[model samples]
Target: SKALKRIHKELNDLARDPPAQCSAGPVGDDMFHWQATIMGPNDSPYQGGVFFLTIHFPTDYPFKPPKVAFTTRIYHPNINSNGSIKLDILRSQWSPALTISKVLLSICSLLCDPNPDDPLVPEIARIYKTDREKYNRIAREWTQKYAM
Candidate 1:
């Protein structure tokens, strides 16, 4: 119940100053479950694509980060084929000060710059590291085919 209240407050704040490329809100009657839509960054391979994500808040939220997963498939070095993203702030590095708006902004940033060092898809990371242009091209194509 407390988590729901906090999430509601955070969602309200996000509505006031939504992330540059994404918007988030609850889904159905479940306050802990939310859906978000993110517009790929203009300079990235995912540009012009709209990505959907699901967010699940823990009962002890604010003390822990929300679980996030892409509902729409995307090809990226930092994201697995199943659309699970690897973000440091969403895991061990999370802080109580972080909010849903911050998380959405972070996801937007991830689309622009992926972490090749800690990649979930090694081959994609190799391509991203060795031949960035080629990687971008493939990623763009994937975005068009799936995310658009």
Candidate 2:
């Protein structure tokens, strides 16, 4: 009951005031599953891209963090080729206070500024650190190819 209520509240809040450059809602009749789209930050190499994501909220809800994955591919140190984003908040750092809006906002911020120190893809991290230009080029390329 708590989980359903929370989910219903979240859906309403999202509809009333969605995050910037991001929109999310339930998928079909499944309230636990959702599809989200995040517009690439204008100042980033991924600019002009529209990244899609899959979200699955657990039945326990606030007690258990939801699972989110990028359905659209992108190139970045913190994001894998398969569109998996590496964020601490989604992992062990998860907290009950966190919301889907917060998650989407952090993703947009991550796109604007990648964290090379703690990376999911080492090669991308290396390129991001040693040659930012090449990183940006490849990121743009992937964004154009997959996120368009």
Candidate 3:
């Protein structure tokens, strides 16, 4: 279908010009499944961490956003303890023009600035809202212990 073709083209483009902070590629024998690794942004809680994630596109992709989940678990308000994310673009606001590279870059940005207003982990959100310093410390510690 047209969506699958677009996905294929996008994948090729990403391979040709891989993002500086990360690389993403299809898993062997599974074009619908992709893996990504992002270098933590400098001077943030996730700095120096290498977070891995898996993205699974449905057969009717582009029309529907792919499922993105972290392979390396970390603490963040928008990301669950299990590493599932609640990013808006990956849900109700998704657009066909948005590519895998864009999703990844958004994820990278998410690590630096979590959206507590729309959180996957409410406890983390509360902490992030009320005790930001503690939240940063814990997030950094989790990055060091798990993502690093």
Candidate 4:
């Protein structure tokens, strides 16, 4: 089908010109289920940490965004304890032109710059807003404790 064909093309494209600080591929026999790795951004508290993520593409992928979540725990306002990310492209803003590579890069960008205004974890958001030093400290602590 068109979906599989597109996925195959994407797989090749990923291999040929992969995004920086991130890598993704099928988990095993199932092409629809994939695992991804995103290296922590150098400018963020997550630097030197490695984060694992799971991606499950729908049968009608590209039309519908893949379900992507962190397998590794991260302490951020936009990412909750369940590893779910509150990003617009993964939800209502998704476009068919967006690929797994693009999504993963966006996640990387999110780590460097979080949107505390619309946060998944309200307490984290509050801390991020009121106490920048404390927020970075805890985020770094969590990265060492969980993501390393």
Q: Cα RMSD to native, each candidate?
A: 1.0, 1.0, 1.3, 0.9
lDDT of 2 by residue, 1-148 (tens): 7887888888888888977789998888988999999898887888999999998999888888888889999888888877788998888888889888888888888888889999999999999999999999998999899989
The candidate maximizing TM-score is 4
State the C-alpha lDDT per candidate.
0.89, 0.88, 0.88, 0.92
Candidate 3 stretches with Cα past 4 Å from truth are 1-3
- Could you give candidate 4's per-residue lDDT for residues 21-96 as a string of tens digits? 8899999998888999999888788988999999999998979999999989999999999999999999999999
Q: After superposition, how far is residue 84 of candidate 4 from its true place, in Å?
A: 0.6
lDDT of 4: 0.92
Model 1 spans > 4 angstroms off: none
The TM-score obtained by model 2 is 0.95
* Cα lDDT tens digits for candidate 1, 50-147: 99999999999979999999988898988887879899889988998899888888888888888998998999999999999999999999999999
- Angstrom error of the Cα, residue 43, model 3: value is 1.1
Measured against the true structure, the TM-scores of the candidates, in listed sequence, are 0.96, 0.95, 0.93, 0.96
All candidates in order of lDDT, best leading: 4, 1, 3, 2
In terms of lDDT, model 1 sits at 0.89
Residue pairs in collision within model 3: none
Q: RMSD to the native, candidate 4?
A: 0.9
